Design a binder for this molecule. Structure first.
Ligand SMILES: Cc1cc(OCCN2CCOCC2)nn1-c1ccc2ccccc2c1
Ligand SMILES: Cc1cc(OCCN2CCOCC2)nn1-c1ccc2ccccc2c1
Ligand SMILES: Cc1cc(OCCN2CCOCC2)nn1-c1ccc2ccccc2c1
Lengths: 206, 213, 214
């Protein structure tokens, strides 16, 4: 099993290393930084329009968009899932309250471009934290674990790469053992299923 | 489409119709406006004096329904990522009245349950973030917030927030959320014992009052 | 009055507690809360990085063979009771532990109710403590020393730069259940759990090796 799971990780990491992707972290970061310094609602709408223009058939429609609460690692915010597959996902994340906690250690590289508010990150193994402002882009690398903190008006555009199904375990831990808000769990499963079916339908049409 | 699960769906539906029918026709003791007004009368005063005056008024207008001072104690409450303390004045299978608040800065998930809850802030601040929005509102002493049935919001409190809270609905379902952090995070089973203790005392007081009538 | 196994299990657990509590009175610990408190208060009001180094040097001087070496030191995240910080474990046994705790973010939550008396001397930042059964909290500043007694439960809150020297006495294995609750049911950071078990095992083996050499 030692060589078994090692070869399995060789196969999975080889697929992630050779898989023609749709998005890239630089693309979403530039598109978000162009609209940084504006109202986060205007930035959200313009970014959604640009994403559907440059990537048709990959972003959910306005009818299928909804703010879903996200409780994880001790912080609470809300997300609007724009795209999601087995290796990529794009969403609009943020909170209207002061929260913070564990960022989560998962098999996925995540990039967050702050549109408004503040982002305090406390990296592992240090005794000092850094504060990031609108326009900045933060890269949560694979296997990294940090402490995150957000202000009462933080909103950002987030893109994640890697083995996405592994990350959902962390995204639903507090919803199971703390909030017990199973309706929010249903909303998350619903919008994720819609994004997966949209990506599957787009693959079928091609 | 026919299956035994269709009967389970209709069975839960008729079970809900029966339970919601009981909740819709059950002569209650308190009402949210009564508790809200009594708490708003004492807003702008020292919250300890307000607590005492509210307890005296509740025991005057509703004898045999509020616990005595011997059975009152501040119990910590950890739920949804926030932490506060409660003083349970009355509790039944459909209603409960308590004095809630925190002396530290906490916040998190308000909880989605089968109960309508009303909180009248005596002192401090209350930040509420409703579901599906991108902006939150801040409520000040005197305000009254109604957390409706099935609603889920994000709450945040200051380092000196204190309020009088009244809840209506299917109370036993809500206790699962009130003890989640106490089981999987704090593991402070002594606080769990205190919560079960004051809950049992309030239920037995209400049962004894019904027996005397 | 047919207690049967019930009246005996109650008395059995009572005898076990008297056995353990007698052992804690006859264990003749190495450190004491006043010793660690003074050593931390001497360097309060200075940079917490400099204070950490001087306290580690003083601890290794006055108690050789009881503090981990620099090779075995690493900052490990600590998630418990709803708050998140970091620790640097200097010494740990079955009845004592010494570490440098603190956080660089604003956190707070349940202090945890366990079978151990804990003393924290703040080097920098602020410490808000909310005792059970009260409606007001107190704020402690660098130089102060807070004693979380056995069986006590308070609400803790720390600022974005709070750092302290902490010493714990009592039945240490019971406390690890609370220290790893959020890491299991909230963070799911199994690598941090591995780090915690790693540094804890190193401290236990160091103390065992020092006892064997004596
Ligand atoms: C995996 C995951 C982590 C997370 O946390 C908030 C994002 N950021 C994380 C790091 O920095 C702070 C905020 N949400 N989320 C998620 C939740 C639900 C999802 C549903 C479908 C697809 C991806 C889905 C992804
Ligand atoms: C069900 C429940 C929710 C809760 O949360 C704090 C209240 N508020 C909620 C919304 O707004 C913020 C604060 N406590 N609680 C509870 C806990 C223990 C109880 C024991 C006996 C009777 C009712 C008992 C009720
Ligand atoms: C049991 C425990 C609680 C805790 O919390 C931080 C300490 N303080 C608590 C009260 O005041 C605020 C901070 N860490 N910790 C721990 C974690 C890992 C340990 C490993 C080995 C030995 C003791 C070990 C002890």
């Amino acid at each position: 099993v030692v060589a078994g799971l090692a070869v399995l990780l060789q196969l999975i990491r080889g697929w992630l290393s050779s898989k023609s992707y749709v998005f890239n972290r630089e693309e979403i970061a530039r598109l978000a930084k162009e609209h940084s310094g504006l109202d986060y609602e205007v930035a959200f709408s313009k970014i959604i329009v640009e994403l559907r223009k440059k990537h048709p058939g990959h972003i959910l429609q306005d009818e299928d968009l909804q703010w879903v609460f996200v409780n994880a690692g001790g912080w609470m915010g809300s997300m609007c899932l724009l795209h999601a597959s087995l290796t990529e996902y794009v969403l609009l994340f943020g909170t209207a309250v002061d929260t913070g906690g564990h960022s989560g250690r998962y098999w996925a590289e995540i990039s967050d471009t702050i549109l408004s508010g503040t982002f305090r990150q406390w990296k592992e193994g240090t005794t000092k934290s850094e504060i990031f402002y609108p326009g900045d882009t933060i890269v949560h690398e694979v296997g990294e674990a940090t402490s995150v903190q957000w202000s009462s008006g933080t909103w950002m555009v987030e893109y994640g790469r890697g083995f996405i199904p592994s990350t959902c375990a962390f995204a639903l831990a507090d919803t199971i053992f703390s909030t017990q808000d199973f309706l929010t769990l249903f909303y998350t499963v619903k919008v994720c299923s819609k994004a997966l079916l949209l990506e599957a339908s787009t693959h079928l049409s091609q």
